[PDB]
Amino acid sequence: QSMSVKGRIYSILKQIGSSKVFQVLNEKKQIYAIKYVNLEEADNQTLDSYRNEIAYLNKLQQHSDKIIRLYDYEITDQYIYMVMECGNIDLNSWLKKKKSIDPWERKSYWKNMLEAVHTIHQHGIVHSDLKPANFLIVDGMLKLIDFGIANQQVGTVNYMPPEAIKDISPKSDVWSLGCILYYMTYGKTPFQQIINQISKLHAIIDPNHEIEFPDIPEKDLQDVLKCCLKRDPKQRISIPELLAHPYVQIQ
Ligand SMILES: c1cc2cnc3sccc3c2cn1
Numbered sequence: 595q596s597m598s599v600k601g602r603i604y605s606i607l608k609q610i611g612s613s614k615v616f617q618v619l620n621e622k623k624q625i626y627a628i629k630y631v632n633l634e635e636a637d638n639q640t641l642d643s644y645r646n647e648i649a650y651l652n653k654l655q656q657h658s659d660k661i662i663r664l665y666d667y668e669i670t671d672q673y674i675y676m677v678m679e680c681g682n683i684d685l686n687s688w689l690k691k692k693k694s695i696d697p698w699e700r701k702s703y704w705k706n707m708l709e710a711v712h713t714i715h716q717h718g719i720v721h722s723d724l725k726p727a728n729f730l731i732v733d734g735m736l737k738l739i740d741f742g743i744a745n746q747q748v749g750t751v752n753y754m755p756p757e758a759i760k761d762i763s764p765k766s767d768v769w770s771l772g773c774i775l776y777y778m779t780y781g782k783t784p785f786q787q788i789i790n791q792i793s794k795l796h797a798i799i800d801p802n803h804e805i806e807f808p809d810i811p812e813k814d815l816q817d818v819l820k821c822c823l824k825r826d827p828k829q830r831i832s833i834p835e836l837l838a839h840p841y842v843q844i845q
Contacts, residue, residue: 597628599668599675604628612636612746617680626665627681631674640745644674647744654717654741660710662730662737681730681737686747688731689777697812699734700778704818705842706736707771712833714741715764722762724770725753726777751791752783756799756825765827768836772822779815780808784823801825814841 595606597618604618604626613631620626633641648669654661663679682688685703689695707729714721719741721728727747730737751759755769773783784805788794797803805823810816818841821831836842 597675599628599677600666602666602677604677625680627678629674629676629678631676633670633672633674643743643745645669647741648674648676650714650717650719650741650743654713657716658709658713660706660735660737661713662739679732679737681732683731684739685726685729685731685736685774689726695778697815700775700815701841702734703729703736703778704775707738707774708833708837708842710736710738711767711771712837714738715767715833719743720762720764721767721770722758723753724767724774725750726774751794751798752786754795754798755827757827759795759799763827764833765830768822768830768833769827771836772819775815775822776819779810779819799825812841814839814844817841 597604597606603621605620606628607617607619607625609616610627611629612635613629616628616630618626618628631644633644636644648664648667651662651664652667655664662681664676665679666677668675683691710729711721711724721742723742725747728739730739753770753773755766757763757766757769777783785794785797788797807816807820818831818836818839821839822836824830831839
């Protein structure tokens with residue numbers, strides 16, 4: 595099985611993920627990821643969302659290694675081919691498969707998530723739909739897969755900020771990152787216990803609904819969670835503030 599992106603031939607190895615993602619090999623026998631997108635039944639608002647996300651991904655590549663590498667692309671009126679770097683596994687399936695997560699790898703992953711989200715924020719981008727499925731493990735390093743600009747773990751309200759439920763600033767991405775770190779800390783998201791979707795949304799917003807923060811041996815890690823998971827965006831810690839917190843800095 596084969597395919598041609600900008601005159602270069604790529605051999606398919608396996609499918610990873612309208613859109614199909616594949617693991618491929620080039621002529622020089624190097625491993626890549628090819629995202630295929632079918633534009634056939636797509637509107638102008640959809641096309642603009644797609645061209646906007648590609649342009650942001652192409653630009654933000656130069657600013658951080660914690661953003662997925664985009665090597666090349668081919669765009670027509672019928673399709674998109676994106677030659678990207680191949681990750682090992684996404685953060686979600688890595689966590690789902692793992693029972694207990696190492697405190698050193700968790701601190702390391704946190705640092706990477708802050709670096710990536712901070713970059714998009716410096717360029718005016720608020721992701722708003724952050725989940726572990728949005729991050730990629732590549733050579734013991736987390737990488738942000740996308741920016742939330744392009745149309746369409748999906749649907750999930752577990753990482754949703756209170757401000758998003760009511761209706762959006764960088765503080766929204768802070769709430770979501772805090773939910774991801776909470777999962778890597780406690781083994782569940784803060785509201786995971788609630789099956790009923792409405793009853794879950796009714797708890798995320800309600801301030802009288804106290805989020806449990808059980809006593810862990812990492813006092814700094816407990817403080818981060820308590821700082822991220824504050825219902826009032828005004829009272830929530832910022833990304834530049836998180837990057838200076840003792841949890842990220844102290845050895
Ligand atoms: C674009 C590029 C990717 C590269 N590597 C991997 S490994 C598991 C998912 C993915 C992936 C998804 N979208």
